[PDB]
């Protein structure tokens, strides 16, 4: 019963909150990565994949803020990175936690009923 | 009569002054919601989807043109007899055309609506954001033809604004449209309060012999990258305890509270946004 309901909650969270969050997060990440890589003149990080990975490192608490220096207008680079950090890390990821708490609050009976139907199947 | 079209009721509610007591709630009245849904499902869903597709194509072409910008120095850059250079230049022309299109669309909005300088910067955030993206694109063009490399700075701010503006089209889908209304309400209320207090604390504790370097080192703590030995211990521990362990968790808690109380208000605001979209499509 307990693990069953926990798995049902995981399913519900993956289908609603993770989905909505991943769409908005991927849009922001691609936009800010296309901006940063365009600003970069050349070097190791002059590819879309490398810059996307560098900006995704921020989501997992491993962002550098100085991962490259092959650019002009350091102010432009710093402002872009700070905007990306404030929009994703400090806002969107905490909002995901807050929306996950609301979902937990509202899907107890639904999650127990779904588990019971699964066991009936 | 005088509901669908006339001062029609729908055009009165949608284009209200943002001081109206129940601007978001008057659309819940029985006939109006069902009329707006009818207009949506009949013709405004298809028109809006076409607009979204066109905007996605525009952003893809702009991203491709900016990605393959030449690095030679002191524009303008002479076109070579290469197919790739012919694709890049046509993409750039399309990007500038879209920027001009959005600039003129913002001017037309500010003219026909005449915002009162408070609802200008308190409501209609989408119009201002698209207009500012267009402004960045036009400034980029002006700098580009002035032989200035700062054109790239204006262009990359236009690109990040244009990709972040794709969140406008989340309206037209209820779940994503309400999530985007909830993102707006978090940004205006919780992020603002937290950022004011957080910036005060950061500047105080920061005040590596330069202010910028120490501010960056102390901001690294917020993103889970703080060193604690980057170059004193009591100051760093006080800053960590007051920002990382207290204020950032308090932000999460307050965000949870907001989400709990804005559920109904977030749906009403999304419905009003879609009504505005349906009226704009009808008029144009
Ligand atoms: C504060 C933001 C909140 C406003 C907002 O944005 O949400 C509005 C939607 O906006 C959009 O288009 C989505 C764009 C948000 C993308 C993320 C932010 C990116 C910018 Br910020 C930067 Br990071 C990119 C540069 C990044 C590069 C960094 C470099 C820096 C130099 C909603 O407002 P509305 O559409 O007008 O509807 C109103 C409604 O009708 C009315 O009835 C109600 O009353 C009002 O409330 C409205 O709902
Ligand atoms: C041609 C079709 C033009 C068109 O139908 O408009 C579609 C797009 C999007 O326009 P929108 O009003 O829906 O965006 C919201 C803007 N706001 C906030 C001002 C309402 O406009 C455009 O990018 C048109 C310019 C893009 C040209 C490159 C084509 C790819
Ligand atoms: Na970390």
Residue numbers in the entry:
A (entry chain D): 560 to 603, 627 to 703
B (entry chain A): 385 to 390, 393 to 593, 627 to 650, 659 to 711
Which sentences from the paper describe this structure?
The capsaicin- and heat-activated receptor, TRPV1, has served as a model for deciphering lipid modulation, which is relevant to understanding how pro-algesic agents enhance channel activity in the setting of inflammatory pain. Identification of a pocket within the TRPV1 transmembrane core has provided initial clues as to how phosphoinositide lipids bind to and regulate the channel. Here we show that this regulatory pocket in rat TRPV1 can accommodate diverse lipid species, including the inflammatory lipid lysophosphatidic acid, whose actions are determined by their specific modes of binding. We captured several states of TRPV1 ranging from channels in which the VBP is empty to those bearing different bioactive lipids, including distinct phosphoinositide species, brominated phosphoinositide analogs and a pro-algesic lipid, lysophosphatidic acid (LPA). Together, our data show how the VBP accommodates a range of bioactive lipids and how occupancy of the site corresponds to the structural status of the pore.
To resolve this question, we exploited our ability to generate TRPV1 protein with an empty vanilloid pocket, into which we introduced tetrabrominated analogs of PI or PIP2 (PI–Br4 and PIP2–Br4, respectively) as contrast-enhancing probes to distinguish these lipids from the other, unbrominated lipids in the nanodiscs. Previous work has established that brominated lipids are faithful analogs of the unsaturated lipids from which they are synthesized. In these high-resolution structures (2.2–2.4 Å resolution), we were able to identify the bromine atoms within the oleoyl tails of the lipids by visually comparing the resulting reconstructions against those previously determined for samples containing endogenous lipids. The well-resolved inositol headgroup of the bound lipids showed the expected differential location of phosphate moieties, most notably at the 4 and 5 positions for PIP2. Furthermore, conformations of both PI- and PIP2-reconstituted channels resemble the apo channel containing a native resident lipid. Together, these data demonstrate that the vanilloid site can accommodate PI or PIP2, where they act as negative regulatory factors to stabilize the closed state.
